[PDB]
Structure formats: structure tokens, C-alpha cells
Design a protein around this ligand. Structure first.
Ligand code: WBP
Ligand code: WBP
Ligand code: WBP
Ligand code: FES
Ligand code: FES
Ligand code: FES
Ligand code: FE2
Ligand code: FE2
Ligand code: FE2
Lengths: 386, 386, 386
């Protein structure tokens, strides 16, 4: 659908992942924080190439396609919400219900035969952990847990975060995050010194292929992911040599982090524990279009009462956001950007030369290829045909 | 020629209009005001995708293609008019007559065999009502009146105006202007209050389909257009309801405007009377390229002597330009812009969902499809082949 | 390979030149001055569409493709030269030798099976006359002299220069430089007055076709070029007439320049003598990509000792650079730019209408078509396929 068929033949058995340049349909995706959208103040965003409107009405979130059925304009060019339950297109006043998208009135012609006989596309929206998730899919949504990493939705788990727009395809972001050897780029992070981390330069793998990862297709809520097990039979590399001469060393700190690393559909990474031995990082790479993604970062820490939550919030702001989310992950951002050119023409997928640690990524490409709930296409974006 | 043949099959009987993304050839178009081009001061513009040069020589206008026959450079990069009757290309001095475009000399080789045996394309130019019209066509031009709305060329009719470049396809501009229900966008215009207009929100049409418009193919000078007759059997809407609740009202002023509205080939709208009961608006949407048009606005008012003309000019400057041409039509401009995305891939023409007032636009699409004097193509732009 | 096959059929026997939009492979090209690259300070550039890294190591130049074999990132995003003889990719520390491009180590996995079994592309580099030349080709390079104009590599010849990036295809630059009638554009140059040059407006050619040029395929070092002989049987034009009236004259100075003019593969012009009767100009138009070239200007003057070289350098800086390289050749730059649009769609090659002086260019197109060492393609740029 999205990629030259000749390229897809050459990547037999990751073909669906390579074709998924616009992301996977029929999954939940986070797109903003609860606090960023107030009652009766609609917001625009693009998700899987589709312009959407989100509104809060009586505290509850509704999502409509931001495209009038009449002449295809964005309603958001000029929002006219003239009753709590509706939005009126600024152009000829076609009026839609937030709840089901039905065209319930037209101000310019209250006798039109279109009234009650057209419906704008809606998508389910759910808040959880102060995060807004949209189900960019058709039919009844699965439970959110299916599309979230283990422990993200535990009651005591306190989630704080940052979101921004990054100029790479979402897959470059996923692959970079789940890439065992990419740790090399983090070797000079401020967070490595100022939080005393142990961080290898890389890994000398051991064991067979299958032992490099755990493929999860047996989780009870239907989650699908891969654990990076390179450290189980593998030896960490702390001395980097060229011609046998030591030219770089890893970091010899006390704090042990990233005991478990896992990537889940539709494209969320869990690193545990990180950036501190008492915390978790969950980050999403959410497809906006083929060139762009939301880098939706969250840090989870169990909190037992309001006091622990106050405490957490204060170190999040003063330490963990500037030192980890920025000071550690900024390098991830420009690593992703550096892969764009080679993958832009879809040929990177056939001309890359992989090495042993890339077995984690291969396993993700196969898991995504097989367990995704649908390939988003340009036809989904441009609509059904009249 | 311009649009995927599969899309053209799906719009049977507006096909030629849908294909006409570069405009219609063999029509007159206004491109600037007389006063903007002085004796011996040539100007560049693009029209139907073609770069043109216009010059005033002994008070009379001449138009040449701004593209040297030799290496395809624009002569306008550096104009060398070295005799009244000629222009010399800055590059190898190939020299052309303004009057007929004939290559009459080459300064770099006065013995060249090309001399007298090559001719640059010319187009007829005519001034009328202080407006410059170019016939972007081949052969002897028709009379200007064919390509102008009724009454624009009456002797007493005093024409004043504004021109600018707008970033939409010309057809989006035409359709917006002739769109009976688009009046909704004008509901908050400064001109509606400060000139006390009656302005409905829209119309509940009545009568049959044929009664919604008058198709003119019987006018004596060969004009072809459509009158919007929605108001004849239709009821104006002044109260906009959602779920039966009044949420917006129209404007209840004294001044009656836009009794007659008509769109003519090649793409000029006449609204009478407007913006005042003693005036007319004629506005053109002139194709520059596929993404761009001149929004050539004029206001006509009968003046019987120099005194009335002085009077007119002074209210034009102080009131009608800032309050109407800008304060009313600015909303038209961004309405046109808002349609670009849906029509950019040529699919809007098949995926729009029209309603009853769009019968005016359908009638225009059929009139344009049938009575246009030619479809401009990329081959017209890039030239005949050697 | 690069141009619609239907266009190539229509230019039978310049087809290879018309297809060579990315330049000719298996030739030497100058890309920078010796002084611009210091010991251990690597530089990035693009040549024939390929991103390259150049380094100076123990005073000697090495060139590697700036593209990691692993995930296709540019090593130059963050250079890590951790031993004199190597460069380590910033991403997973794949480490390459400058000398042969062999992947000799990976810091992230010193046990990888890739080590010693992969090789990054290298290109030969040679300095001569304080100019850096790269052989953008495969196999053992020919001697540099093959790809340089006569006399450029004479021991006494002192070479000084300027380089910059110009936004046209390299062929527009070549053709402009070797274009006998383009001298018209130089008629108002500051250098024409302030250095008292004789400069015609153009030429009335005489003799037959073959006498307009000397095609050199008989030079002993394998050089291939064309001499412009228009002035041998031709008459210079000093009076430009329109309808027999003199409207422009040439320049009637004392200093005779440009007695011999020659264009050589891969695309270097020699004008002798110029810009002074005791000097030579050699300028290259080096393909960067399809839209861009290095305009690599040099002035050669025989110097017999360090004193003459000091003298030369001082007038180069104070006079010849600002007055000639800039004050004369700046017009060349915007002439080249003015041809871009007509040649952008590859149709200029069929729709141009040539005249008698263009016989020099035709002869160059045939010489290039026949004696080029290879056509650079997008496949050379994007690589061999896995
Ligand atoms: O993925 C990792 C491996 C080892 C140490 C830290 C990380 C890590 C944590 C959060 C986000 C990332 O991109 C990481 O690379
Ligand atoms: O087209 C109209 C319909 C009703 C009231 C005013 C206008 C009008 C007049 C001039 C230019 C326009 O775009 C209009 O919409
Ligand atoms: O090519 C030329 C012909 C006659 C006089 C000067 C030149 C010349 C010298 C150096 C570079 C150029 O582009 C020229 O046109
Ligand atoms: S485009 Fe929205 S009502 Fe017409
Ligand atoms: S391009 Fe105009 S004379 Fe050569
Ligand atoms: S991209 Fe260079 S080592 Fe991985
Ligand atoms: Fe990372
Ligand atoms: Fe309007
Ligand atoms: Fe020149």
C-alpha cells in the first residue's frame, strides 16, 4: 500500500512493518496530557496522518475528524461551538454532534435533505495517568492495557511527562530506543555522572539467537512486545579498543539501571529501572505523518499517598525532567534524525548491514509485522470514495 | 491532460472543468491597472503558467512571452530595450520586435541565418476601464465584451479596483464567490454593521432544480454565465437553529444588496447591487499557475460627469476599498485557502458531499465545461517541440 | 539512467551528455584548496551526489564515504577520530581505517563477526598546485594530467584561486563558459575598463563547421577537449545594430586576451591569456548534485622564484580576485542561474534553438558524450543492493 512492492518482496516477513510508514491502525496512542485540554477549549492535532479535534465536555473527552464532509475544510480554521454538544463548520454551518459525529443541523439550510443522513468520523478517547489516549481505529476499542507496557496502569504508579514533535519516522525512534548497542551515544550524558550510573559502552553477546530476546504473545491482556535479554548470556563492554588499545571506557557508577528493557505495540518502550533505581521510563513514538512523531516521554514512580506524589513532582521538575528526559534523551532525538536520509526512499530497509545486537530490532520487526492490528494507508487519510 | 484520467471518468460532464487546473485558454483576462504601467517601463507577470512581458510604446500596450527562443532564459532578468520597437535578450542579444515578436537582429552575429526566420509568441493586449486585459490565446481575439460581465463596459460606468496574488487555485475562488450559502462567513463583516446591510445566514430553497439558476448561452455578444436565482422561490434564513434553539441571527439592516449574482467565463463574478444600493462589484479570479490566482476586484458606479467621478474616487479610497474590498472580501480569501488541501490531489472533486445550494456551482461547472474556449496544458506552458 | 528515455532518443549522439545530470564518474575533480584542510581536522563535502570525508594524516589526504555501513548515518554528524589511522561512528562505534576503509573494530561488540569483513568506500585524493583533487571513480586512478588543461601542472605555474557553491547544474556552467557569443554579458564589466581590454560584442563566423573548433583526442597524456576557433576565420563584432542603427559598441582597449579558449573533460575551461596578457584562467564546474556545482576558479602565472610568487599573491588579492574572479565572472554566475528553469525538466536540451556560435557547444557535447569515463547514476549514490 505505502512502499514500492519490489522493496516489500526483498524484506519477506517484515514486509508489513516496512509498509507501515504511517503507523498501525486499530491501536491506542497518547497525544497530549489531560491538563493541556480544558473544558470547552477544543484542540487540533494530527495522528496517523489524520487531522483530529478533541474537546472536553462536562469533563469528558470527545474526538472528531477535523474535516468537514461538505467541502473538506478543517473546522479548526475557525471553531464555532454554538451548543455544548455540537460544532458548527465556519463555512456553511454544517453542524455535528461531538458524541457521534452526526450531522444534526445546517444553519444555512434547515431544510437540507443531508440533515441526519451524514456522520463525521469519531474516535474513542480515554484519559489514564493524566495522559490522553486516542483509539485511531474502527469498531469497539480493545481495553487500553493491551496497548500499554506492564505496570503503567497500576493504581500506585504516579506518571509525569513531556511531549514534543520530532522530525523522524516513528520506526526510527522505536528502533533507536530498543537498540542495545546505541547506549554508546549516551556515554557522555550529564545524567551518567551527576546520578552515578553504571553504563557499559556495549555488549559481547552469548547464547543462541532465541536467547537474545523474550517474545511476549502470551500476556493475559493481549499485550505484544519483546524483552531485550542481551545482558543475560552477554558480557557488558566497558573498555573500547582500537587495534587492542583502550581508547574509551564506560561509566563505573554505583546505580544499576535498565535491568529490563521492552518494546510493545503499537510503539512504546519500557526501561526499568530508569533513570533512578526506584523509577521506570515509558516512552511512546506516535506517528503524526511519515516524517514526524510525538516523542511522548513518561516517568513512573510508585507513590502510596499525596505526600510521596508532591515529593515526586518536585524532583521530576527540578532534576529528572532537565537531567534525564532532556539531558539523557536529547541524544536519542538527533540519533533518530541522523537515520532519516538512509530510510527516506525506503531503501535503508534493504541496504542496512546489521550486526549481532540488532537481533533485538529484528525480533521487534517480526513481532510488529505479525501482531499489528492494521496498516494505515493514504486511503484511510484521504477517506472513503463517492 | 492535467488530471489523472481515472478521476476525470468519475466526474463525467464536468470533466473539462476538473481538468482545467491551469485555466481556460482563448479568453481575455485582466492582469493589472493601466496606471501601473508607464511608457517604456516593461513589466513581468505570469498568466495561465506563462511568463509574459508587457510594454507601453507610444501609449499602446504590447505583450511578448518572457522566454528567449535561444536558451530559454527570461529576457526580464535584465531588460535591454535599445530601440523603441525592440527588446534585446541580455544573454546573446537576440532582438525581437514588440509588435509581432519577430527576431529582427542578433547583435552578437548580424549574419546569423536565424535572423527574420524566428518569432517569439505575442498576445493581444487591450485597455478598458483603466484595466489591462491580455488575450491568452491563439488566433484573432474575440471582442472583449464576450469575456466581461454585463454593464462592465457601459460608457458611464466608472471602474476603480484592487489586485493581489492569492494562494489558491482559481476554481476555488470562483466557486466560493458564486456559493449562495457561503454568505454565512460574512455574518460578522464590519461592512454589514457600518453600512446597515440586510444579510441572511443562508437560504431554504424552493422550486425545482432548473429554477435555482438562469444559464445564459443566448447573450448577443457571446457571453456565457449563470445567474444565482436561489432567492426567487427560496426563503432567506435569518435564524440559525441547533436542536430548534436560535444560536445565531442574520443582519436586519435597511440596505438591500446582491439582488442579482452571476458568474461568467472565463471566471468573473458580478454582484449587483454591492457593496451599496447604487454600485456593482465585478471581480475576476485569474489563473497564474495551479496554486495561485490574481484576485482582481473592481467596483463600478455610473458617473455622468467629472464631478461624480471625483466624488466616487474619494469614497472608494476612504470607505469602499477598506470596508468592502478588504473588510468584506478578506474572509473570502481565507475561505478559498481553506479548501486547498482537499482539492490539491484532485480528489476533492469526487469526495466532496454537496447540498442543495451547491446547484449554483454544479450549473457553473457544466457551463464552464461546455462553453470554455480551450484547456491550458503544461505543453502550452513549456512550448511546441523541436 | 537519469533522464526520460523519450528525451534521450530525441538527442541521438549527445544522449550520454544529456543523461549525465550528476556528472561523469572515473574522473578527478578539485573540491577545495590544500590550505583549507589541516592535520587531523576532517572535512565533509558532497561530490557527484556522494557525501565524503577528507582527512589529513601525517600531511597526507585520505577520503572515505561519509556513510556508515551499519544504519546509513553520516559519521560527520559527530566525528570521533580516536586513533590517527581510524574513525569511529558516533552511533555504535563501528571503526574504519582511513587508508583502506576496512572495518577494523567495533567498540560496542569487539567479538562481532562483521569485524574485518566489511569495507567503507574510499576514493584517491591528490594535492597539486595547492588544490585538492578527488578521483570520484573505481579502480586505479589515471594520472591527474589527463583531467587537467594544458600547462596547469607546469612547475613554474603559480596557481591562486577561489571556490564557492553555485545553484545550477554543472553543464549550464560549462556551456556558458565555452559559449563564444556569451561575451555580450561581459560588455559592462569593471575589468573591461579598469584593465583596458579589447572585447568584442560577438563574432560573424566564417569557414566551414569543422573550422569553428579543434577537437583534441590526440593529446599524449589522454586529455580530451575542444578549442574555440571562431576568431580564426571569423570577424569580431564591435558594433551592434538594430535595423542598421548602431545601439551598442564593444570595448576598444589595448590588452589582447583570450587568444585560446578550450574546454576539457571532466569540465574545466582554460582561457589564455586572461585576465591579463601575462596570465591564464583555469576554472572547473564540479557536480555536487543535479542542482549545484563548485565554481572552482584558478589564475595561473609563471613565477621563476619566491619574489615573483610574493608579487603575484599580492596583486591576486588586491586586484585580480575582486576585479576579475568576482567583477568579471559574477555575470557568469547569474547567466547560469537564468538557464536553470528551461533545463530543469530535461526539455531544454530538445527545445533550445541554437545558432552558429553554438557549434562550439555542440562540439563539446559530442566530445563529452564520446570520451567520458562513465555516467554517475542514483544507484552509485544510494549504493550496491543487499
Ligand atoms: O534504552 C536504554 C538502554 C540503556 C540505558 C538507558 C536506556 C534508555 C532509557 C530511556 C530512553 C532511551 O532512549 C534509552 O536509550
Ligand atoms: O456573493 C455574495 C452574496 C451575498 C452578499 C455579498 C456577496 C459578495 C459580493 C462580492 C464578492 C463576494 O465574495 C461576495 O461573497
Ligand atoms: O570565455 C571568455 C571569452 C572571452 C573573454 C573572456 C572570457 C572568460 C574568461 C574566464 C571565464 C569566463 O566565463 C569567461 O567568459
Ligand atoms: S465546508 Fe463545512 S459546511 Fe461547507
Ligand atoms: S538566451 Fe537569449 S540570446 Fe541567447
Ligand atoms: S550507524 Fe554507524 S555504527 Fe551503527
Ligand atoms: Fe537512548
Ligand atoms: Fe463572499
Ligand atoms: Fe563569461
Amino acid at each position: 500500500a505505502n512502499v514500492d512492492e519490489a522493496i516489500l518482496k526483498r524484506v519477506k516477513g517484515w514486509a508489513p512493518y516496512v509498509d507501515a510508514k504511517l503507523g498501525f491502525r486499530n491501536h491506542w496512542y497518547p497525544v497530549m496530557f489531560s491538563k493541556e485540554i480544558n473544558e470547552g477549549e477544543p484542540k487540533t492535532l494530527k495522528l496517523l496522518g489524520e487531522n483530529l479535534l478533541v474537546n472536553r465536555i462536562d469533563g469528558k473527552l470527545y474526538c472528531l475528524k477535523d474535516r468537514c464532509l461538505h467541502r473538506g475544510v478543517q473546522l479548526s480554521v475557525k471553531v464555532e461551538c454554538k451548543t455544548k454538544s455540537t460544532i458548527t463548520c465556519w463555512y456553511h454551518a454544517w453542524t455535528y454532534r461531538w458524541e457521534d459525529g452526526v450531522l444534526c443541523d445546517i444553519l444555512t439550510n434547515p431544510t437540507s435533505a443531508q440533515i441526519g443522513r451524514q456522520k463525521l468520523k469519531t474516535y474513542p478517547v480515554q484519559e489514564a495517568k493524566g495522559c490522553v489516549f486516542i483509539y485511531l481505529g474502527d469498531g469497539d476499542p480493545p481495553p487500553l492495557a493491551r496497548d500499554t507496557p506492564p505496570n503503567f496502569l497500576d493504581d500506585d504508579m504516579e506518571i509525569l511527562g513531556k511531549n514534543q514533535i520530532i522530525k523522524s519516522n516513528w520506526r526510527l525512534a522505536v528502533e533507536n530506543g530498543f537498540d542495545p548497542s546505541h547506549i554508546y551515544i549516551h556515554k557522555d550524558s550529564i545524567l551518567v555522572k551527576d546520578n552515578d550510573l553504571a553504563l557499559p559502552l556495549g555488549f559481547a553477546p552469548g547464547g543462541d539467537r532465541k536467547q537474545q530476546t523474550r517474545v511476549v504473545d502470551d500476556d493475559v491482556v493481549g499485550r505484544k512486545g519483546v524483552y531485550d535479554l542481551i545482558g543475560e548470556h552477554g558480557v557488558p563492554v566497558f573498555e573500547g579498543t582500537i587495534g587492542g588499545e583502550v581508547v574509551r571506557e564506560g561509566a563505573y557508577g554505583e546505580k544499576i539501571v535498565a535491568n529490563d528493557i521492552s518494546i510493545w505495540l503499537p510503539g512504546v518502550l519500557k526501561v526499568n529501572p530508569f533513570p533512578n533505581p526506584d523509577m521506570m521510563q515509558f516512552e511512546w513514538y506516535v506517528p503524526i505523518d511519515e516524517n514526524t512523531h510525538y516523542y511522548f516521554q513518561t516517568l513512573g514512580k510508585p507513590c502510596a499517598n499525596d505526600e510521596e506524589r508532591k515529593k515526586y513532582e518536585q524532583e521530576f521538575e527540578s532534576k529528572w525532567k532537565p537531567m534525564a528526559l532532556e539531558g539523557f534523551n536529547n541524544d536519542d532525538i538527533w540519533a533518530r534524525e541522523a537515520m532519516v536520509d538512509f530510510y527516506a526512499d525506503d531503501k535503508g530497509w534493504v541496504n542496512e548491514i546489521l550486526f549481532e545486537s540488532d537481533e533485538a530490532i529484528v525480533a521487534w520487526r517480526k513481532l510488529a509485522s505479525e501482531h499489528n492490528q492494521g496498516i494505515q494507508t493514504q486511503a484511510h487519510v484521504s477517506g472513503l470514495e463517492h
